[PDB]
């Protein structure tokens, strides 16, 4: 998208593998505010927002909390308390043409600064002077959008960069975006400290003799004690016999 009309994808109800992102050699800018990138995979959020656009290289530094400039003031504004990550890479090989790529636009004229996460797509003629414009361009009456015209021979400061801003929103509503939380192999006939889907304990897991229903997960003895569990990956029922102990 053009920065003034930046695109937003709302991401929900999915597992996020962030290893794909931070372990990538292909990004030139990767700054996170309020979250550690490596330590994102053990966090759940209620919504993820992906905002994407193209700007000048000289403008990449404006995609940050508390920044100023034509982009931060009039095109895309992050809040001062931003919890998310800004990712950017040079796309001169893609978003520039030899005659100049005029498809990408930015807002050049605006009376006041954007609120955070505001998106102004208006094309109203901008009144730079005392007498009004009435949709007619001219002196002191300026179309608010301008084009970058990316040419491949531009210096880095004028070459196009693609930017993706990931926002991590956490509301008082059920969380639907968590990180992978991989598992390991299981061993039987040995005292283990185990943590199945939602329960944790210590004991020996053994091949069972019971017939759990297709929807049953955790067993229970008469005295409200966990007795058997359903392994989340293998459809096998494991009896939990607490590890041997006794007085000496």
């Amino acid at each position, epitope marked *: 998208a053009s920065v003034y009309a930046w695109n937003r994808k709302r991401i929900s109800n999915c597992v996020a593998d962030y290893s794909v992102l931070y372990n990538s050699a292909s990004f030139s800018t990767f700054k996170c505010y309020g979250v550690s990138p490596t330590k994102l995979n053990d966090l759940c959020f209620t919504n993820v927002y992906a905002d994407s656009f193209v700007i000048r290289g000289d403008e990449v530094r404006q995609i940050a909390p508390g920044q100023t400039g034509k982009i931060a003031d009039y095109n895309y504004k992050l809040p001062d308390d931003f919890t998310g990550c800004v990712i950017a890479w040079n796309s001169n090989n893609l978003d520039s043409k030899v005659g100049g790529n005029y498809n990408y636009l930015y807002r050049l004229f605006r009376k006041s600064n954007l609120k955070p996460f505001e998106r102004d797509i208006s094309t109203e003629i901008y009144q730079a002077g*005392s007498t009004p414009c009435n949709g007619v361009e001219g002196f002191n009456c300026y179309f608010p959008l301008q084009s970058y015209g990316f040419q491949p021979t531009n210096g880095v400061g004028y070459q196009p960069y693609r930017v993706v801003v990931l926002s991590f929103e956490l509301l008082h509503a059920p969380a639907t975006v968590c990180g992978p939380k991989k598992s390991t192999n299981l061993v039987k006939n040995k005292c283990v400290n185990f943590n199945f889907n939602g329960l944790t304990g210590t004991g020996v897991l053994t091949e069972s003799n019971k017939k759990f229903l297709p929807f049953q997960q955790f067993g229970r003895d008469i005295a409200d004690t966990t007795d058997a569990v359903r392994d989340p990956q293998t459809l096998e029922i494991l009896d939990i016999t607490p590890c041997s102990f006794g007085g000496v």
Partner: antibody
Amino acid sequence: QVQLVESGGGLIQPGGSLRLSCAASGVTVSSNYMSWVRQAPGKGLEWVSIIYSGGTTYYADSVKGRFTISRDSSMNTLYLQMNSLRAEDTAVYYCARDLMVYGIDVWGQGTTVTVSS
Amino acid sequence: EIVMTQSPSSLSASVGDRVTITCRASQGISSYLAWYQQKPGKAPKLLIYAASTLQSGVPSRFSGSGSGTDFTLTISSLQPEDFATYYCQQLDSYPPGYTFGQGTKVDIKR
């Protein structure tokens, strides 16, 4: 009548303070990129400061922490407050309306600042 | 940092001559260039913006051309009121500031 009229220049000893005015008609100062540009004798145009319509301000490194740009919407006037003045600040000071890619199209007549002991 | 190299420092021209002034960007600035005129004791006057567009009210004998690194101003038929100094400006640069060419003085040939 589209014009920029500067005033406030004069002779002042180093370390003194000086406040330049730039009165506009036609152009609305608070709706435009407004810059201060100066030119020392026999030297080239040197940008000093700019104020965005949204309120953002920038300053040349050589004047950071000594100059302050501002504006009075009710007076349609641009101001430059110059403190801790030095000899090498001596120049004619212009105010200008910046249109970025459309160039700088409106310039004032200039006011002269001389800093000397 | 991007450097603007303007040449020549001075040229001499009679009235009616075709004048050509050159500006070279140290790296590609596409069309982010403007041309100005300035006379002794006066403020600059904008002539061409966006490398090749003629500012309103400027006589049609002025013309700009070029994109990327090499730019030229052209005065197809020099008039008496065109003896001045001319220089180029990189538009929308970073860090903040106005980078101008060194200037070309156009004096009267004799």
